[PDB]
Design a protein around this ligand. Structure first.
Ligand SMILES: [Ca+2]
Ligand SMILES: [Ca+2]
Ligand SMILES: [Ca+2]
Ligand SMILES: [Ca+2]
Lengths: 139, 138
């Protein structure tokens, strides 16, 4: 698959992910696909079923979510390994208010470049801890 | 520059980084290169002189620092944009105990592929916060 094919599938993943339902967020993944969280403090690996469950729980907190590529010129594409790297802004409306952060997403596409076979997500882990403290303060 | 040329320059950057002196941390960078921190909570930007000053300050805390690419299968190379992505383990001995973390480094090489012209570094920011809080205890 071409560089443009690979970025296209990654942008489709992002679009479905912004719909943020258990079905939409696996919409563009292979059946054996795995989702990794980077960094020791939030280490995690989720197959298709755990990703759906995770999204269902998150929906209790996140009313709507928009992740967007901050600059398409910053996107990294490796045609040999079928990987795309996005640096994304994340904006959310939540039960404790505004969510505003940035994250790095890495996608490895399937052999035909049409599905996402593997994801690595790198979040601002200090911001996540600060958000969890906000959740701990509902009255 | 080939895929292998880009990778070799990033591996050379890491090799010299591990010598951990202001001299070594600039020795594979272009003179006008800038180093970015990813993530809002840690956002910063360092030219060459600022990177030397920060290394000098770090060596007052870090007795040693060692970085390594965990698995070459993880590495991402974009020949068109001349970028290499490494996922790294970092370990160091500190005046407040052990430093142990992981980080993502993105390099963009010069046009001839032989130097690092731009760096983006993504750290575990909660771990970094906690390490700074270990330093606040004196
Ligand atoms: Ca509320
Ligand atoms: Ca909690
Ligand atoms: Ca100092
Ligand atoms: Ca402090």
């Amino acid at each position: 698959p071409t560089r443009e094919d690979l970025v296209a599938t990654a942008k489709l993943f992002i679009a479905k992910y912004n719909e943020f339902t258990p079905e939409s967020i696996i919409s563009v993944r292979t059946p054996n696909s795995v989702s990794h969280r980077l960094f020791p403090t939030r280490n995690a690996t989720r197959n298709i079923g755990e990703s759906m469950e995770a999204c269902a729980n998150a929906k209790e907190v996140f009313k709507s979510l928009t992740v967007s590529v901050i600059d398409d010129n910053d996107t990294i594409v490796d045609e040999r390994t079928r990987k795309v790297v996005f640096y994304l802004a994340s904006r959310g409306d939540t039960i404790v208010g505004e969510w505003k952060s940035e994250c790095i997403f890495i996608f490895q596409m399937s052999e035909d470049g049409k599905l996402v076979d593997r994801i690595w997500a790198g979040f601002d882990t200090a911001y996540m801890d600060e958000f969890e403290s906000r959740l701990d303060g509902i009255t």
